[PDB]
Amino acid sequence: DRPRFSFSIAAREGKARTGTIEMKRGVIRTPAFMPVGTAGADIILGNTYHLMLRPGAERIAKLGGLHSFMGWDRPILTDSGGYQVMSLSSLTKQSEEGVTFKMLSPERSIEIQHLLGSDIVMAFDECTPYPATPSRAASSMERSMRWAKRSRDAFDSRKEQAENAALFGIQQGSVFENLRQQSADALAEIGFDGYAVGGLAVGEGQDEMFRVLDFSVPMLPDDKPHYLMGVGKPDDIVGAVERGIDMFDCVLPTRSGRNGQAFTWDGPINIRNARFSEDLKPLDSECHCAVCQKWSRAYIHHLIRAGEILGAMLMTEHNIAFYQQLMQKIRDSISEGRFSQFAQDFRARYFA
Amino acid sequence: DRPRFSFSIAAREGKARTGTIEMKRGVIRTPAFMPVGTAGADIILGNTYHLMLRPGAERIAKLGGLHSFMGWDRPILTDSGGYQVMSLSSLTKQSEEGVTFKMLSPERSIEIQHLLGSDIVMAFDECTPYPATPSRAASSMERSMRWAKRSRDAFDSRKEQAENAALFGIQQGSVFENLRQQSADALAEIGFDGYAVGGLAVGEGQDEMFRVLDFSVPMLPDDKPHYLMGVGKPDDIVGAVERGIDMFDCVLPTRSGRNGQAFTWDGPINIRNARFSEDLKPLDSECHCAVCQKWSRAYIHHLIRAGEILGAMLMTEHNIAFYQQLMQKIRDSISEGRFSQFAQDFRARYFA
Ligand SMILES: Nc1nc2c(CCc3ccccc3)c3nc[nH]c3cc2c(=O)[nH]1
Ligand SMILES: Nc1nc2c(CCc3ccccc3)c3nc[nH]c3cc2c(=O)[nH]1
Ligand SMILES: [Zn+2]
Ligand SMILES: [Zn+2]
Numbered sequence A, B: 001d002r003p004r005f006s007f008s009i010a011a012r013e014g015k016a017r018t019g020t021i022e023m024k025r026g027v028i029r030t031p032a033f034m035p036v037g038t039a040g041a042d043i044i045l046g047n048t049y050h051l052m053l054r055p056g057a058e059r060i061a062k063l064g065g066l067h068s069f070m071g072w073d074r075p076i077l078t079d080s081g082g083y084q085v086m087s088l089s090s091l092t093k094q095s096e097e098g099v100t101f102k103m104l105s106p107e108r109s110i111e112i113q114h115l116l117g118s119d120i121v122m123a124f125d126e127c128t129p130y131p132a133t134p135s136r137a138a139s140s141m142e143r144s145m146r147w148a149k150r151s152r153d154a155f156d157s158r159k160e161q162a163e164n165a166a167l168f169g170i171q172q173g174s175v176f177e178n179l180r181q182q183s184a185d186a187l188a189e190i191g192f193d194g195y196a197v198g199g200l201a202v203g204e205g206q207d208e209m210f211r212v213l214d215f216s217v218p219m220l221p222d223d224k225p226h227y228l229m230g231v232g233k234p235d236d237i238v239g240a241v242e243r244g245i246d247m248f249d250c251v252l253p254t255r256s257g258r259n260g261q262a263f264t265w266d267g268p269i270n271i272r273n274a275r276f277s278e279d280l281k282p283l284d285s286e287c288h289c290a291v292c293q294k295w296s297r298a299y300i301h302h303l304i305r306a307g308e309i310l311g312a313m314l315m316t317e318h319n320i321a322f323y324q325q326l327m328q329k330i331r332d333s334i335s336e337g338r339f340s341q342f343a344q345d346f347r348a349r350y351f352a
Helices: A048-053 A057-062 A066-070 A082-088 A106-116 A134-156 A159-164 A177-190 A206-219 A234-241 A252-258 A290-294 A297-305 A309-335 A339-351 B048-053 B057-062 B066-070 B082-088 B106-116 B134-156 B159-164 B177-190 B206-219 B234-241 B252-258 B290-294 B297-305 B309-335 B339-351
Strands: A006-013 A016-023 A026-030 A044-046 A076-078 A120-122 A166-171 A194-197 A226-228 A261-264 A267-270 B006-013 B016-023 B026-030 B044-046 B076-078 B120-122 B166-171 B194-197 B226-228 B261-264 B267-270
Touching (some): A044 A066, A048 A106, A057 A106, A066 B297, A106 A120, A134 A159, A166 A177, A252 A261, A252 A309, A290 A309, A297 A309, A309 A339, B026 B309, B048 B082, B057 B106, B066 B076, B076 B106, B106 B134, B106 B159, B134 B159, B134 B177, B177 B206, B194 B206, B206 B234, B252 B261, B290 B309, B297 B309
Parallel strands (some): A166 A194, B044 B076, B076 B120, B120 B166, B166 B194
Antiparallel strands (some): B006 B016, B016 B026, B261 B267
């Protein structure tokens, strides 16, 4: 049987790495993109915030857990819920115990993720608002580090979870190198199975994010996976892999798919635009996905313009397939020692 | 090679028949349900009214026709467009030449369907409003019969269409037996490849529709397929097959699928209802579709309640699959001489 958690690096190029995470439910090839399970990927995302509200974490456990519920027997990552409460909820009330909204604490977060049955459990953190002064960023980071220890203990107190899932710590510190170093030191001292770079993809722009990644990723344990949360556009991913990131999630493939935007090797396109009404080429000339095997930009443009659900499904299937082809190309080129050439070739074509 | 059009009846029970329509692009097993191609079926529907407006019939021909456009190389039926103009358009203006809206004529209808490339072409008729007085129903029917002859001639003037497609005449006459007889006589004298019962599914209720079918279907040529337009609910189809109908279309599978209603052997259910929030059974216990193979009512209820497009796609896939399983069961039981028992068993379970 596979171990509970084992990360091995098969090849490197500069700061980039490619390898595998072994877990009881399957293997995850890295760098990995992790799509929302609500729709090939090796791991999908559960929506902790939505699930604790409908139908509730207890109801999901009663239904047999998220794997059974969603019909997905491979690994599932779940976020810890505070980021989502802090962005999509009202009348939020924060304190050292946790957050109240209309009480999510480290312990409750971990228990919710346990009842959901997810394989990769995120520590309960505070995604510090951007921008932030040094003092507020430090205060926030210090509380997240106390909350990280409380998450560690809650996770270790549940035998089924401690023996079958994995726990990731989330680095905070806003854009400040010394706070990122302190956060990294505190996490490493607690000890986690993986480490996420939190508090980015919060409006900072790609230049600032890349700058923060430049000094932040090397503070994490090299021998454990690095998860950049909430990122990102295809060029964000390529640049973040260049900076040592192993795992990604982003709202873009599914949000774009529902709003008429398709990702291609030549950049994104809005398929609703009239220039596609008679374009017989598939969404992308090279894409191996099923949509691109059967249908033209013209027919997908027509479905979406007509309001047919089929169109949004075909766009979403293509976008998710495109992201996985991107990750496959990143892994192959790292493994073959030509990732640097690939990144240059990707950006020249993607931005042309 | 298959012929342009050949209908053969393999077995009968009472007025019910089962058999096949051979056409150059494929075989159609009857009784047949014909789903909207905009999403196994043997024939799909093109939306003449929408397509003549976006992107236009000429643009579809420029793109290679509807088979190429939709990625579907099997038969396609198209309606003649007037029913749709008369129900979904504004500022309609009618005359002996045709209908003007914001000029669809028999000749233009046929040419539009030719440019679309459909395999089964509907005569350009007037679906008489319901209810209607004898005099208005007769006037309307008499114009549709003149229009049927004009459709015949337009169809025969286009060599590629006359040699590769099929043309159906549409009986009108509202609920009046003598007008239905006159309409049937006029169509048979013109001569068509199949005959549709038009002017039903316009609000009359199942009792009245079945009454009209009782005397109307036997006026049509027995040796040609009978197409009841716009029908219907599963119990409508079963009863119409009992009355000699061979072909059906209906908005229900796709409209229901987008609004939370799933058809089952035990009747329809609204999956959004709270009673399904913890129901681990598939949408239907017997259904062989992929959705019912993998997912519970509970998870589909959750997707739809959450607004996820995945849910509406899974409901639609199930509903269309259910209709085709219904038709398969009708064909098998007719062919095995137990359709009467089947209809009784279907209604007892469906309405229980
Ligand atoms: N816990 C946490 N989540 C973040 C997310 C959501 C990632 C997520 C993972 C899995 C499911 C849903 C959401 C961010 N999205 C954009 N920027 C983000 C920052 C953070 C962060 O600092 N902490
Ligand atoms: N031409 C025509 N169409 C009808 C339709 C649409 C069937 C159709 C077929 C293929 C595609 C779209 C629509 C009806 N729908 C409900 N009742 C109906 C009656 C008629 C009718 O009398 N004539
Ligand atoms: Zn594709
Ligand atoms: Zn089903």
